[PDB]
Design a protein around this ligand. Structure first.
Ligand SMILES: NC(=O)c1cccc2c1-c1ccccc1C2=O
Ligand SMILES: [Cl-]
Ligand SMILES: [Cl-]
Ligand SMILES: [Cl-]
Ligand SMILES: [Cl-]
Ligand SMILES: [Cl-]
Ligand SMILES: [Cl-]
Ligand SMILES: [Cl-]
Ligand SMILES: [Cl-]
Ligand SMILES: [Cl-]
Ligand SMILES: [Cl-]
Length: 268
């Protein structure tokens, strides 16, 4: 048997944030997401969801800000993605895709008075619609993150519009989940922090985000790194190009979702 155990907690604050504090935060996220024992083409693979002990399924990210408010995000270790959050006496979860995932989230934030699962999932297509803006028009950086934290904090008490909540999720997901998944996106956020800049992601970032699952599959199914079919990405100017091999992505992608295929049939 395995006894229940508090999930790992990683902390970040926008108050006095630096390139170093952000870098150390993303390092901590990647470290708590991975075992270090499953690494393919120098890129860590996340734990497999199937049969994963519930104590190992999630990590918590506690976010604080200049307003002296705090919220805690839950990340799914199997895909690095935000599944919900807690603030004060309330927790909110994105709609799970299946009954196994719905059961898993019952182990999160089990001390809160009020638990709610949204009807909607946390996918960008839906969140962008709710926000009323595409990712290409939602600024990222320490300023946006500061205000996103406050929006999440005040949601339960009626302080936050649905579009603002959705926009705030979009900000947090990219600055935390996508930054953990991609050194390239971490670098994008580091540069914003370095210059106290706010700016929306360019097509290179957006296409990487969109392609993360496909890239994970392509890399893990590759023949000594060579892809079985190319993956299309975009340059910063939006121009399309194809990737055929893991080599070019080793400095770009930091985590992959676990992939496997069942055996071929062994009987007629
Ligand atoms: N527009 C917002 O991000 C927002 C939504 C709900 C509550 C708050 C905010 C917001 C933005 C900037 C400073 C403070 C706050 C405040 O706590
Ligand atoms: Cl438990
Ligand atoms: Cl500061
Ligand atoms: Cl629940
Ligand atoms: Cl928890
Ligand atoms: Cl949805
Ligand atoms: Cl999407
Ligand atoms: Cl838009
Ligand atoms: Cl903004
Ligand atoms: Cl911009
Ligand atoms: Cl290539």
């Amino acid at each position: 048997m395995i006894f229940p155990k508090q999930y790992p907690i990683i902390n970040f604050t926008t108050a006095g944030a630096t390139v170093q504090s952000y870098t150390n935060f993303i390092r901590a996220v990647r470290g708590r997401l991975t075992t270090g024992a499953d690494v393919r083409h120098e890129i860590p693979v996340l734990p497999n969801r199937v049969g994963l002990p519930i104590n190992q399924r999630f990590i918590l990210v506690e976010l604080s800000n200049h307003a002296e408010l705090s919220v805690t995000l839950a990340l799914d270790v199997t895909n690095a993605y935000v599944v919900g959050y807690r603030a004060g006496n309330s927790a909110y979860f994105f709609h799970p895709d299946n009954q196994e995932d719905a059961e898993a989230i019952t182990h999160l934030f089990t001390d809160v008075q009020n638990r709610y699962t949204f009807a909607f999932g946390g996918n960008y297509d839906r969140l962008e619609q709710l926000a009323g803006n595409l990712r290409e028009n939602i600024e990222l950086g320490n300023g946006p993150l500061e205000e996103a934290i406050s929006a999440l904090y005040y949601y339960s008490t009626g302080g936050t519009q649905l579009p603002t909540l959705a926009r705030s999720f979009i900000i947090c997901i990219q600055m935390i989940s996508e930054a953990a998944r991609f050194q390239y996106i971490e670098g994008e956020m580091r540069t914003r922090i370095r210059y106290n800049r706010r700016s929306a992601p360019d097509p290179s970032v957006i296409t990487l985000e969109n392609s993360w699952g496909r890239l994970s599959t392509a890399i893990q199914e590759s023949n000594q790194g060579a892809f079985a079919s190319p993956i299309q990405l975009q340059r910063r100017n939006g121009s399309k190009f194809s990737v055929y091999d893991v080599s070019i992505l080793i400095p770009i992608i930091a985590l992959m979702v676990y992939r496997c295929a069942p055996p071929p049939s062994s009987q007629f």
